[PDB]
Amino acid sequence: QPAHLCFRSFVEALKVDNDLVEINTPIDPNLEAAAITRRVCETNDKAPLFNNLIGMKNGLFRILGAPGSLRKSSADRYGRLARHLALPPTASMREILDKMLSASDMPPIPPTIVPTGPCKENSLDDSEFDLTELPVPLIHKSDGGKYIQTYGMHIVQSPDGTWTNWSIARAMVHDKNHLTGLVIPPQHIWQIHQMWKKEGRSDVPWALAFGVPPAAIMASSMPIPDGVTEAGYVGAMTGSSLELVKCDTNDLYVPATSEIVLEGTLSISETGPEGPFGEMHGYIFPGDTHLGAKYKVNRITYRNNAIMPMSSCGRLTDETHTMIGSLAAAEIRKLCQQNDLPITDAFAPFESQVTWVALRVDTEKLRAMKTTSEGFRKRVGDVVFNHKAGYTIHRLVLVGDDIDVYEGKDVLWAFSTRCRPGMDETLFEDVRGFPLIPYMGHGNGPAHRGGKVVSDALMPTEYTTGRNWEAADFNQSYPEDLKQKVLDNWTKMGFSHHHH
Amino acid sequence: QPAHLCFRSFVEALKVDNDLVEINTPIDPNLEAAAITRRVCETNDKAPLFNNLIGMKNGLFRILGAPGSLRKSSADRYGRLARHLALPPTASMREILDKMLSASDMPPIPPTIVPTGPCKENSLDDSEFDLTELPVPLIHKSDGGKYIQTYGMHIVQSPDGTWTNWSIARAMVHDKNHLTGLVIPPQHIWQIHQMWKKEGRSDVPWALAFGVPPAAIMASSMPIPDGVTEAGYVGAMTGSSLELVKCDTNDLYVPATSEIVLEGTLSISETGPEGPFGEMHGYIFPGDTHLGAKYKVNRITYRNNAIMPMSSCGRLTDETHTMIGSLAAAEIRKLCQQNDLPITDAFAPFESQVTWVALRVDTEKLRAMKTTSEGFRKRVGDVVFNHKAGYTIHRLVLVGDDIDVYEGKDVLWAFSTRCRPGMDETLFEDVRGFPLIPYMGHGNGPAHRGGKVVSDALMPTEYTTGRNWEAADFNQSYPEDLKQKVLDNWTKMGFSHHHH
Ligand SMILES: Cc1cc2c3c(c1C)C(C)(C)C[C@H]1C[C@@H](C)[C@]4(C(=O)NC(=O)N=C4N2C[C@H](O)[C@H](O)[C@H](O)COP(=O)(O)O)N31
Ligand SMILES: Cc1cc2c3c(c1C)C(C)(C)C[C@H]1C[C@@H](C)[C@]4(C(=O)NC(=O)N=C4N2C[C@H](O)[C@H](O)[C@H](O)COP(=O)(O)O)N31
Ligand SMILES: [K+]
Ligand SMILES: [K+]
Ligand SMILES: [K+]
Ligand SMILES: [K+]
Ligand SMILES: [Mn+2]
Ligand SMILES: [Mn+2]
């Protein structure tokens, strides 16, 4: 099975890439696995595969940390993400985001039901498992629970059966047969949960599949449109219908090669203590527990020698940055284009803790619009900040054609030198805010509203007659023949490889 | 003579450090020298010494590029700056800034007059030189002139003789015996020029000394207080009285070991075309010429085999960042402390193009003040933005004790995650602005006023009861014994030197 379509094959691909460290000696899921993983993410090291996890019983479970984090070399920096998508390991961010957007103007390819798969190799009923007895990790020392769910896919369906959503949302073990987790607006798991609650008849049939096809976990992390079933979007992107098997205890379908599947229900009435958790912006607020959604687990099914992927998230760089940020940026780029805004590229700078998105403007198009900064700022912020795709993003930075938004150094240069504080910005206080950013949920203002800004780093002539500067850099401040001479004589004179 | 007290010894020190590349083949001062230097600055390579400059005649002149730029290794990153000050090459930024501030509560050590020095080894009178015949560099392709003066020290004295100012301000060749340059408020060369213009009697006696003692060029770049003679401040900092020789044609005094000295006058009535120039924020606006101050040169004196230092300034990283930014930050730190504000450290992040200063707050002190963000923001901005030391700085970022302001990654993390846009900021529109920032002088608003902001990245509890988070990082999210275990087993498990 191809690496993008089968987690187990993905792990083999990382090994073959020399991007995997197999640790076969005992590792404690209480902090140790996650501390190793954290150190890997902070240093862009190889992904750790913990094959000897203290507390693993009857096949549950090995852990793979850092599945979507960065490689050390610049040439294959995003290779782990490329391996989720059948792309070359040297793929650029633009090529990864284009791949993730490609299914947006293709017919869906619905999934294929198959009678069985590797996820059915083992099962545990209601009398045979205890979630508190599994080697679920404690990921950060002050976490409010053991976060089983950091890289699996929740599967829920609208009451009318017409939309089946796949998404990532955190969850922790509550007791032997329940989880608690985040289910918050405007997320699709929340939107679907609301539909079931308004019907008022039953709890939401649910499954959570870990170690799903890598292309599916990528779509699970992306804010594709309301009402779009992720399975058909992944089918179109990959050009292949995904193979799904029915759950044993409900009529939901899970990827045939899922490593581990939990089947049960998401309550429309019950809650339980959830959090705190060491989160994407780099913080944990110890003791900040709140009531979260409550899931009941009725059945576990799993592969022989099952592997649980884990995100040890926090400070740069992990899956919450590489996937949340970048995939929101990709959808925002599309959204802008669909609203007739002249945006060519979008990325969420890592340096912003993925709270900014830099939007590259086609300034020839902009000049034809005969508009102004104030007008344009307002139009861009109204489009993005009133849409779900803008949820996580609190600052939009508009930049001209000379800036590569995928290079944080260039975005910071443009921001710092072309956007006059206050005058060149529009604040948005009557939009939904992302409460997990510390300045929102633990800040001075409403946790769920406002705190957003569009910062215009377009210069005045970019709206009128064209760029009227050249950079004071080696590239722009010297003619071609001189530059080349300098480069050709560099080592000869006495001054100091691409892959590495 | 010690390296901090003699430019020629400083060049030898860079050689001995293996931080110098001597280029003994012909190099063109038209762009080539500056392109090499630019490439060095963008890659933190060794300083270039051009010993064979096309057009050099009768000893005028060799060029040293990148005298105050960065080294590649982290361990001696600031070694070229340390060599200006007799510090170890591994000195931290805090240690360099502390050294530059040390004379602020010491009695000045006035300079010593000596009858002669190496700067008197050669002379050229009014009939013997032509500035257009010297190998003055063209530094950027669109510059409006050949910028002779990028790393020399202008020397002017108040009419009453009580204050002698040393400072760096750019100047270019106008014709055979004149320069034009920037002389703008609130700079001390401007303040002194205004005193002479109000007297109305004569042009300002002036000298410009290139290749001055390195400790003197550092003070020349620092906004030490109005009315303080830099020579006595440098004396106190170094613990030694500087040796000066009188000019031949006026009664100003220049460092005895200056490589090259121009003597003449700064006009109180005449102006000439000046600029454009590839400037510190990374831009040049071709054709943006304006009338600047006009200097007449009456005499040149110089050392045998004179060396002209040059800054090929622009995009990161050069003397305009390492010296302008950092030395303004140092003075702002002091200014804050003198105004009873609880600031421990200040630095201008390179990532901000040195337009921000991050101010580290002693939050124990802050809590005792029983104040609020709004109150505190306003007080800090009124102190700094109404003072000359804040001139170049458009954004102040207040950060708590956990942030190392000398680490741009940590400043950006704090800014991005702890400062709510708008609510946690105070804009300042009625303060002097720095027109050279593109968003000021080429922006949408008044070039010389406003555009400043204080961004408070202190969290709410930092004002009241104390920090209420831990970082979700390896350092903070795992206990000490575990961290150490992980570090000790890192290479054994299969994962990947200080100097490099
Ligand atoms: C890649 C990734 C994406 C995450 C999360 C994580 C990782 C690794 C972990 C679990 C580590 C941390 C948490 C923290 C949190 C941010 C959250 C979450 O708990 N709640 C949430 O609502 N959104 C999350 N997302 C983003 C989410 O997947 C996207 O917003 C996606 O568009 C949702 O799919 P729908 O569009 O179909 O609604 N988590
Ligand atoms: C280290 C350095 C410092 C510079 C400049 C440069 C370098 C290398 C160059 C020449 C390359 C570029 C220009 C551009 C420009 C910024 C300027 C200038 O032309 N005008 C100005 O007014 N201030 C400049 N400074 C800063 C100045 O030295 C400090 O502000 C100092 O406090 C002044 O001394 P006083 O306090 O005693 O007034 N230049
Ligand atoms: K999704
Ligand atoms: K702007
Ligand atoms: K000075
Ligand atoms: K704040
Ligand atoms: Mn969805
Ligand atoms: Mn001064």
- Residue B470's SS3 state is strand
Distance A238 CA to ligand 7 centre (A): 17
Amino acid at A80: R
User: Residue A493 is nearest to which of B21, B394, B485, comparing CB atoms?
Assistant: B21
For an interface test with A, give the residue of B49, B283, B352, B464 to mutate (most A CBs within 10 A). Answer: B283
For ligand 2, whether the C-beta of B387 sits within 6 Å is no
For ligand 1, whether the C-beta of A153 sits within 6 Å is no
Tell me which H or E stretch contains B347. strand B343-347
Q: Is B168 marked within a binding site?
A: yes
Cis peptide before B317 (omega within 30 of 0): yes
**Are the C-beta atoms of residues A210 and A63 closer than 8 Å to each other?**
no
Longest C-alpha distance within chain B, in Å?
80
d(CA A175, CA B496): 39
**Bridge partners of A284?**
B470
d(CA A166, CA A159): 15
Task: Record the resolution, in angstroms.
Answer: 1.4
Smallest CA–CA distance, residue B280 to chain A, in Å, is: 8
**Torsion of the alpha carbons at A429, A430, A432 and A438, rounded to the nearest 10:** 20
String of DSSP letters for B291-324: EEEEEEEEEEEE-TT-EEEE---SSSSSHIIIII
- Residue B343's SS3 state is strand
d(CA B429, CA B435): 14
Amino acid at A321: H
d(CA A395, CA B417): 11
What contacts A378, CB < 8 A, 6 or more positions away?
A426, A454
d(CA A80, CA A7): 12
* DSSP 8-state class, residue A322: I
d(CA A38, CA B311): 42
**Are the C-beta atoms of residues B12 and B3 closer than 8 Å to each other?**
yes
- Residue B395's SS3 state is strand
Classify the C-alpha dihedral B394-B231-B319-B191 as positive or negative: positive
In B224-314, alpha helices (H): 230-238
B423 contacts A445? CB cut-off 8 A: yes
For ligand 2, whether the C-beta of B328 sits within 6 Å is no
Burial (CB < 10 A; 0-12, 13-18, 19+), residue A235, is buried
Q: Is A196 marked within a binding site?
A: no
Smallest CA–CA distance, residue B303 to chain A, in Å, is: 26
CA angle B463, A278, B456 (to 5 degrees): 30
Distances (CA, A) of A225 to A188, A229, A327: 9, 9, 13
Tell me which H or E stretch contains A368. helix A363-369
Alpha carbon B127 to its chain centroid, in Å, reads 35
CB-CB neighbors (< 8 A) of A419 in chain B: 439
d(CA A380, CA A360): 12
B198 CB neighbour count, 10 Å cutoff? 10
For an interface test with A, give the residue of B416, B454, B487, B489 to mutate (most A CBs within 10 A). Answer: B416
Burial (CB < 10 A; 0-12, 13-18, 19+), residue B250, is middle
d(CA B483, CA A38): 11
For ligand 2, whether the C-beta of B311 sits within 6 Å is yes
**Are the C-beta atoms of residues B347 and B326 closer than 8 Å to each other?**
yes
Tokens of A54: 């203290």
Q: Which ligand is nearest to the CA of A397?
A: 4
Burial (CB < 10 A; 0-12, 13-18, 19+), residue B369, is middle
Alpha carbon A310 to its chain centroid, in Å, reads 13
**CA neighbor of B166 nearest in space, from B180, B156, B179, B175:** B156
**Bridge partners of A48?**
A21
**Token match 């004071």: residue?**
A472
Residue nearest to atom 32 of ligand 2 (CA): B223
Distance B324 CA to ligand 5 centre (A): 10
**Are the C-beta atoms of residues B344 and B373 closer than 8 Å to each other?**
no
**CA neighbor of B3 nearest in space, from B59, B61, B77, B82:** B82
For ligand 2, whether the C-beta of B20 sits within 6 Å is no
Helix axes A93-101, A326-338, angle to 10 degrees: 60
Alpha carbon B378 to its chain centroid, in Å, reads 27
Q: Is B166 marked within a binding site?
A: yes
Distance A208 CA to ligand 7 centre (A): 15
CA angle A183, A186, A188 (to 5 degrees): 65
Alpha carbon B438 to its chain centroid, in Å, reads 19
B94 CB neighbour count, 10 Å cutoff? 15
**CA neighbor of B288 nearest in space, from B140, B394, B189, B176:** B140
Distance B297 CA to ligand 5 centre (A): 22
d(CA B324, CA B327): 6
A450 CB neighbour count, 10 Å cutoff? 22
